[PDB]
Amino acid sequence: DNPGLGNCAFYAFAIGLVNIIQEEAKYNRRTMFDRWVGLDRSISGQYDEILKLNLEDPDKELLDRLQSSLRIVTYQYQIRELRNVCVFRNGNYNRLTGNSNFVNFAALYYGDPLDTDSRFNPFADSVPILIKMANIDRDSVHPGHENDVLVPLFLDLLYGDTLETEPKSDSPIITAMNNITQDFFWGTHLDLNYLAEAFEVNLHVLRNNSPIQEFVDIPERHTLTLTNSNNTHWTTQITTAR
Numbered sequence: 001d002n003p004g005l006g007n008c009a010f011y012a013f014a015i016g017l018v019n020i021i022q023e024e025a026k027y028n029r030r031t032m033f034d035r036w037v038g039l040d041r042s043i044s045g046q047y048d049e050i051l052k053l054n055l056e057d058p059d060k061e062l063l064d065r066l067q068s069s070l071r072i073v074t075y076q077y078q079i080r081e082l083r084n085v086c087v088f089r090n091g092n093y094n095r096l097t098g099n100s101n102f103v104n105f106a107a108l109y110y111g112d113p114l115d116t117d118s119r120f121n122p123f124a125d126s127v128p129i130l131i132k133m134a135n136i137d138r139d140s141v142h143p144g145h146e147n148d149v150l151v152p153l154f155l156d157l158l159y160g161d162t163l164e165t166e167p168k169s170d171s172p173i174i175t176a177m178n179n180i181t182q183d184f185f186w187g188t189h190l191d192l193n194y195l196a197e198a199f200e201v202n203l204h205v206l207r208n209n210s211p212i213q214e215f216v217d218i219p220e221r222h223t224l225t226l227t228n229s230n231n232t233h234w235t236t237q238i239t240t241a242r
Contacts (some may be wrong), residue, residue, distance in 0.1 A: 003233065008119075008186035009226075010067035012234035013195055013203075016224035018053050018066070019238040020201075025051055026241070032199070032222065039198055040069045055238055068181070070195055075180040077194040083167065086160030093151055100190040101177065106150045108133050119186040120231055122179035128172040132157065188231050196224065 020032050030047065037044040049062055078101055085095050096102050105123045107115035108130065118124040136149055158173040159166075167174055179185050189205055196203035202223040204215045217223060225237040 003235075006186075006232045007234045008067075009189070009192055009228075009231070009234055010070050010187045011063060012226045012236045013192050013224065014063055014066040014070055015055060015058065015236040015238065016201075016226065017070075017199065018050055018058075019055060019236070019240075020222050020224070021050055022053070022055075023240065035199060036069070039073045043069045071181045071185070071187070071191075073198055074187075074191045074194045075177060077198055078180070078191075079174070079177065081194070082158075082173075083160070083165060086155065086158060086167075087165055089162070093147075096151060096154070097147055100193075101173075102151075102154055104190075105129070105154055105173065105176075106146070109136070109146060109150060118179075118184060120188050122185060123176045126172060126176045129157065129176065132172075186231065189228065192226075 017032065017036070021030070021036075024030060024032055033047055033050070043066070046062070046065065049059075050066075053059060053062060082099060082101050085099050089096070101122075104115075104121045107121060108123055108126070115121060116124045123129060132153055136153075141149055154173065158171055159168045180187075180191065192203055192205070200221050202215065202217040202221050204213075204223060204225045206213050206225070206227045208227070208229075227235045227237075
C-alpha cells in the first residue's frame, strides 16, 4: 500500500474500535461491541467478522461497513445535540453559536475554501443555503454582527424551537447533514468527538505541532489514540497486551 492516498477520520476511528473489541475478546468481554449494538442494532451480526479482521491488512469491505455505521451514529448524535441546543435556548443564543454544525453552516457566509470543503463541512455546496446566503445584504451587516442574520436564518431553515422538538424532514439543514453519511464526506475531529462520547472512549488525536500534547482522560474508559495531518491523513495506534 501507500499512505499518500489519505485516510479519513471515520476509518481511523473504526480501526481503533476494532482493536478495542479484539483485545476485549481476549478477556472474555464484548462490552464495546455490545455498546456498538446499542447505538446501531444493524451491526450486531458482524461480531465474528470483526474478531477475524487482520488490522495489519484490514478487509476494506468490512471496514467500509463499520465506518458507515459510525457515520450514522455521529449523524444521529449531532441531530439530537442540535435539537437540544435549539429547543432549550436559555435566554442566550450562543451555545447554538458554538455548536459545531452551526459553525459549519456559518462558514458558507464567509466562503473560505478551507472551511467549505465538501469532505469536511456537510453544508458545503448546499444549493438552498447558498441561495439564502446570496440574498443577504452583506453591506447591511456590521462586522461582528453576522450572527444576528445567521442565527435567525439557521433557525428558520431548521424550524427549531423557540415550533416543536421536530425540525422539518425536508429542512435544508437536515438534508445537508445527511451528507455526513456519504462516502465523499471524510469527517473531522468534530465528528469523532460525538463518537468518543457515544462509545465512551477517551479520544487522543495527536497533531505534531506542539512539543507537548495534552489530554484529560477518564480512567474507566478505553482510550483511542489517533494522529491527524491536515484532516486528510489520519493514522490509528493499535496495541496488543502481552
